């Protein structure tokens, strides 16, 4: 009469990567790293906006330059990994018998599942701090339906245009908030209302910005540059593919910028991948022997809102594998 062990199983932890997700569409990864070396966290820009040369004798149209200073946000990301000391006592003890060789391989696998835990924790903490940066400098849409509309601003912020801007905020707080709930109670116009609201967000976000360059993060089917990224939850991701219905690309994006992080990003992740942890521990075991004798596809559904082809990525799976709130 026996007791069957019907199999034994473990889960494969998925390797998330910040340059693999589409949250890095809205971030340019500079290889400079001197603003960590710089003492003050400011950088001063000599921007110069154009001007309209006016002709009537009101005032001379003097040139416009602005000496703007952008302070940099330095965030500190720290996890810890409590590792047992009798794992270290087998790590330093050279094994000879096959049972202690199996126990030493188990100790190395426990150690290499903690360095991998640290690297997998600093590629989730990186996405978490980046997403919390993009949620700290994200004013709500009921403010920037009008503050990003120039037909109300640029006449001079007096008391009257601000007193009307607050009363205009209070309208978009009521008749425009929870737009995917009004689209469920809408009639046959499901798609055009949601497309109008998403295009209004893309229009209110996109303005003037310093430090521009090449068309980064193109898609693969259309070849169009990707304007932004819609970080959504998974239920809203399901709802924006039955309302919008389709995707411009088959969840493929083609960034050739991910070319210096296929080298600098791999020689940390694959340097703790148990092929190098076991190798360096065999190297130190040989020292203990020496001692007494002496581009790519990015999975991101791309939707087309007018002329910009933005991406829609949900990091809900990234946070549900932590049992951490999104």
């Amino acid at each position: 009469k026996f007791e069957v062990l019907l199999g034994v199983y473990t889960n494969a932890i998925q390797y998330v990567r910040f340059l693999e997700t589409a949250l890095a569409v809205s971030c340019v990864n500079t290889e400079f790293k001197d603003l960590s070396r710089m003492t003050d966290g400011k950088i001063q820009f000599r921007i110069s906006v154009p001007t309209i040369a006016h002709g009537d004798g009101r005032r001379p149209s003097k040139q416009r330059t602005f000496i703007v200073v952008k302070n940099c946000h330095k965030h500190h990301i720290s996890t810890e990994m409590e590792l047992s000391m009798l794992d270290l006592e087998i790590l330093h003890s050279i094994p000879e018998t096959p049972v202690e060789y199996a126990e030493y391989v188990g100790a190395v696998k426990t150690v290499a599942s903690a360095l991998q835990f640290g690297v997998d924790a600093l590629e989730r903490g990186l996405i978490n701090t980046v997403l919390s940066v993009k949620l700290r400098h994200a004013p709500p849409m009921f403010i920037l339906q009008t503050l990003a509309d120039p037909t109300f601003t640029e006449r001079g912020f007096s008391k009257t245009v601000k007193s009307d801007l607050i009363a205009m905020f209070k309208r978009h707080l009521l008749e425009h908030s929870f737009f995917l709930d009004r689209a469920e109670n809408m009639g046959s116009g499901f798609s055009q209302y949601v497309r109008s609201r998403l295009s209004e967000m893309v229009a209110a976000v996109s303005g003037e910005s310093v430090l521009k360059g090449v068309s980064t993060y193109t898609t693969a089917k259309g070849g169009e540059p990707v304007g932004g990224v819609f970080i959504v939850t998974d239920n809203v991701l399901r709802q924006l593919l039955t309302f919008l219905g389709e995707e411009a690309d088959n969840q493929i994006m083609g960034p050739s910028s991910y070319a210096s992080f296929v080298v600098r990003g791999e020689n940390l992740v694959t340097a703790v991948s148990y092929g190098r942890v076991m190798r360096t521990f065999e190297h130190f075991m040989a020292r203990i022997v020496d001692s007494p004798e002496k581009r790519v596809p990015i999975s991101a559904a791309v939707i087309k809102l007018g002329n910009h082809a933005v991406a829609v990525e949900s990091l809900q799976k990234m946070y549900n594998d932590t049992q951490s709130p999104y």
Binding site: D34, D40, K42, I43, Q44, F45, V69
Partner: peptide, 23 residues
């Protein structure tokens, strides 16, 4: 200060061909 937002490419030493101190 003066370098509140500026990088510096190099500096100008006060004729000191082997000394790093001074203005």
């Amino acid at each position: 200060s003066a370098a509140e937002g500026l990088f510096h490419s190099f500096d100008l030493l006060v004729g000191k061909d082997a000394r790093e101190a001074g203005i």
